[PDB]
Symmetry: D2
Amino acid sequence: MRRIAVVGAAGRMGKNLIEAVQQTGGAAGLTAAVDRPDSTLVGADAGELAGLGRIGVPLSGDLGKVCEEFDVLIDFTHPSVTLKNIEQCRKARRAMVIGTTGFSADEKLLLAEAAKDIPIVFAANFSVGVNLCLKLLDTAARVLGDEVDIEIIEAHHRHKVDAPSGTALRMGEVVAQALGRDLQEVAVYGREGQTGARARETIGFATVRAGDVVGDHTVLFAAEGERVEITHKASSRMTFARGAVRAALWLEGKENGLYDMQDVLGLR
Amino acid sequence: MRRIAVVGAAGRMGKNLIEAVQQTGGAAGLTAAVDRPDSTLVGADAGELAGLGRIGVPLSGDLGKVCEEFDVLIDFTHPSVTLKNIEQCRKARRAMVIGTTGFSADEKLLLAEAAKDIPIVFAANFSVGVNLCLKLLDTAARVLGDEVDIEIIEAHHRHKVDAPSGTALRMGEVVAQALGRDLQEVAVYGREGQTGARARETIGFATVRAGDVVGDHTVLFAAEGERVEITHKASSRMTFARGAVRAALWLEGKENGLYDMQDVLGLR
Amino acid sequence: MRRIAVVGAAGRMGKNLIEAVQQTGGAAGLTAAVDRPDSTLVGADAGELAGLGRIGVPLSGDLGKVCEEFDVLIDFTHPSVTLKNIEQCRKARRAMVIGTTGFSADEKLLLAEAAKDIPIVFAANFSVGVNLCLKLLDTAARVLGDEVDIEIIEAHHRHKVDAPSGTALRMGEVVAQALGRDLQEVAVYGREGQTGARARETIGFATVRAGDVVGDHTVLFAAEGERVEITHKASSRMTFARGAVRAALWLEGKENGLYDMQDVLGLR
Amino acid sequence: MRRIAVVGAAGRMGKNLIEAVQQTGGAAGLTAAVDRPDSTLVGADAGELAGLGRIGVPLSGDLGKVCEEFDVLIDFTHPSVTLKNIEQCRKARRAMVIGTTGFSADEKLLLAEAAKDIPIVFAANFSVGVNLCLKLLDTAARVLGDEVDIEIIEAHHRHKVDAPSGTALRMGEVVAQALGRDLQEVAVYGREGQTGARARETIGFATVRAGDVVGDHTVLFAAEGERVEITHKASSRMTFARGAVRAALWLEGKENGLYDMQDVLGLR
Ligand SMILES: NC(=O)c1ccc[n+]([C@@H]2O[C@H](COP(=O)([O-])OP(=O)(O)OC[C@H]3O[C@@H](n4cnc5c(N)ncnc54)[C@H](O)[C@@H]3O)[C@@H](O)[C@H]2O)c1
Ligand SMILES: NC(=O)c1ccc[n+]([C@@H]2O[C@H](COP(=O)([O-])OP(=O)(O)OC[C@H]3O[C@@H](n4cnc5c(N)ncnc54)[C@H](O)[C@@H]3O)[C@@H](O)[C@H]2O)c1
Ligand SMILES: NC(=O)c1ccc[n+]([C@@H]2O[C@H](COP(=O)([O-])OP(=O)(O)OC[C@H]3O[C@@H](n4cnc5c(N)ncnc54)[C@H](O)[C@@H]3O)[C@@H](O)[C@H]2O)c1
Ligand SMILES: NC(=O)c1ccc[n+]([C@@H]2O[C@H](COP(=O)([O-])OP(=O)(O)OC[C@H]3O[C@@H](n4cnc5c(N)ncnc54)[C@H](O)[C@@H]3O)[C@@H](O)[C@H]2O)c1
Ligand SMILES: [Cl-]
Ligand SMILES: [Cl-]
């Protein structure tokens, strides 16, 4: 089977990753789990810590002591940690799946550099469903062309501070690019009063903020006689964990390089 | 059976009214149809003109010519026309259903003045479903109270000039009044950038403009653990015609006065 | 403030109840938390156990030792436990909110008996949104009458063994009763092949089983020209916890008796 | 401009085709309109008959009379009629768009035989959105694989006789073929009682019959953490007419052969 290590294992995503690894059924197995060296959770069973049954893998504090018991490392931590993990995995010639965000430009260049020596999957969004939708949106925009009005409707919980969501904006950009438009020029984010007849080129954003919604995204393509909607509904962050594990498996037998979920899903 | 006349019978709502009347299964029947005396369609069968089979009712040009041949007049024309229609019905002591919009405050007083002598149903919206939703919203808002975020999502076709719709704003007003809020003070019509966390008092409007959508309206009430949605979808203007016909039957036996659809539907 | 005890505090619902109590903001406060006497969690902070900050209330093993530090007891345990709690609360003249399910008929009679001496809220479903929807459905069915086709669409996760859900069936019964129909006679649960034109009286159930869906419920009322949909979407069991806490507060100053959520919500 | 003739011009699709042709912004124009020689509508303007302004094209009764006045014939009539239409177009060497349904396997061979001499677009469904969705479904199914539960939810009006729709079954077949399943073996059309936990291979159909719904189709792909939905909503039969007109323009310059909408839309 595929031997998978998880670093940041005691974290929110790390716990989800442990779970998604066990849910592959002998395709993969957890062989290592690493968190902070100064963590009082060090020594505890990684399975128990994630709310699962006892797996038989203790939480350890140093990737170096276990750096040879795995085939691939999945990393959802913090840039300063991932850089150190990159170093150890590169030296040990082990593949990586990196979900950590917030890398600086210089920190990013290190990723491509390490990708000379090891195969890496690096993605800002590991959701299989979201990445699939991004491809479907490109196909739909190209087929439907300038016949349709395109509107992006999203809902998120009452605590979200940014609107529209990063995902909605990305969907907007996919559509804009497919139709040769500049999103920033044609985007509308609200409507109040006498707005007038809709321009065909407009990409409209209707944004709902309410309750505890994890994240709903719909792109509507509407013309006379018909509507097409492509919709993603998230219920938890397990979607990112499952996509990371898929990436970890996909990496088996792959040439050195820097890949993303479009590669993993065969959508590029 | 109930003898129904339709004025503005060649118009958009007029044609729908003819169809809605004929569809009553024999409870009612069309006995007169009037449009402009100006009309080139004068003489043509009312059924044929509405795309139905021949009904046996020619399109008349003068309400006065057929004044003594109907129990109730349904009027979807124009304020100037209705004000004249009213005086004729008032003198002939005939009941009216008035769907015409755009009356001044003074003219409404004139309608009421006439309603002293005849029963009249006068409503800004004759859709049974929309008026029902207005009542359901008041109930929902009172029960859920300040615990929920309330968002009003609507979609209309690409040629609609005003946003949010009059129906969406009315839904807004119903919820605001139930919760003791000033809609103008708490309404939000768009979201862009760092809007920050949502204030509970906010009534948000997310408005979609696209394709040929006749009119979709949803009110979302959201809190931790659950969403409640009250939704109306219009497929054609037949919804208003059917509601007007329901009013015309309801008027039978009613004492003089000025009524609305909340009276007709018993929602008051 | 309102002093609230929670029994079954270490359980799934008990943990949610602790959380919903703290989320009232001085309207209520947790003063006691009881679970199994033989629990090794006894002594631990009820707040910490539920994943919250330290509340200052230890988990105890016996309601009797604390039976006077609270105004109302919320109980989500098991019938054999609740019966004992009923006894202690009755003697101490303390109100109760009972969410425990699975009572036998004889066990139920004890509830009504205790309700001679104390005020009790007892409900099979403590969700405010679901109970609200049940009332809205009655209003809608009565207003729309035999003009509409009524269809109940629900979705639940891939592990649910019963179809349609208990909630969908209850919604079906509300509608059936409102229109004077027998649900069992008019219900349809699937459609395959040449089913023919739809009978107006039919109440249709379209049931989706997929993924991890917690529970979506929609009642569609459809006629020519329009659709009305009343929809409840659950995201977690916190909805039941929040409704129980509302009941606990509602009980303040109430006469002895047996109440349900229709009373709490003022919908009866 | 492209010279388009419509046969069955007085029919339901015929009228829609006339409108769709006139709406092309001058890319195309109607030059002939044929219905039964039997027709009482013979002589009437094609625009007027379709509820449009006078177009200047009288309804003809014989395809042979106008055989040399169009580049492409759009045919939505009846198999017996189309088989004759084909031989005339074949001899006049005129391209065809055939929307007529209900051909035998032998007659399809005859269509192909004719397609040896003229270019023909022949499709069971001319909606651009529906055909697009068929392609998106194949992509979605291949990417998501055996990880998801796949459910097909559709709604149609109260007079539709067959369930699920032909479009829903086709969507079922697309997904089944992508995943190497036998649709007949894995399809489920209803759920009642203790159905038990869902098998992953199952393709579920939840079918709604209600009101005047022209046709809503949704395919849900669900797994832990996320739902993906691909949705088509038809508002009128204009969707098929617009697609047929797109095909008629696409045919310009095409070599002889038998084409479908996957060719027209480049989805192959
Ligand atoms: N790409 C995606 O799809 C996606 C999705 C969700 C989150 N993220 C990113 O994943 C990262 C983690 O998110 P989280 O919410 O899981 O944060 P979190 O803080 O819950 O978990 C982070 C873990 O890193 C551990 N950690 C810190 N220093 C360490 C070290 N030196 N060695 C090992 N472990 C160490 C912390 O102890 C903690 O357990 C963030 O960058 C977040 O943006 C990416
Ligand atoms: N209350 C509602 O629910 C509702 C819904 C839709 C429309 N409306 C209102 O209905 C009215 C008409 O709507 P429409 O879209 O049918 O417009 P329309 O212009 O198609 O119909 C107007 C008809 O009135 C006829 N008319 C004009 N002067 C006349 C006269 N002196 N005597 C007789 N007929 C005369 C015109 O010839 C035309 O046929 C507008 O005020 C619109 O706002 C109300
Ligand atoms: N009415 C509703 O809306 C609603 C909603 C959800 C669950 N429920 C009902 O709530 C009950 C609990 O559900 P759960 O899923 O929370 O089960 P759970 O088993 O997670 O929690 C039950 C708790 O009861 C505790 N318990 C057992 N014996 C006890 C005793 N003698 N004294 C004190 N505590 C004791 C157990 O230790 C456990 O912590 C069940 O009857 C379930 O059907 C009702
Ligand atoms: N492929 C698609 O996407 C699609 C969509 C809708 C309908 N259809 C098919 O289109 C066909 C017609 O659909 P409709 O609903 O428009 O039916 P319809 O009967 O309204 O139209 C039929 C028309 O054909 C005319 N006709 C009959 N014999 C004729 C002849 N010998 N010469 C000329 N005209 C003649 C009739 O007079 C009538 O006007 C059916 O086969 C239907 O299945 C296909
Ligand atoms: Cl109500
Ligand atoms: Cl694709």
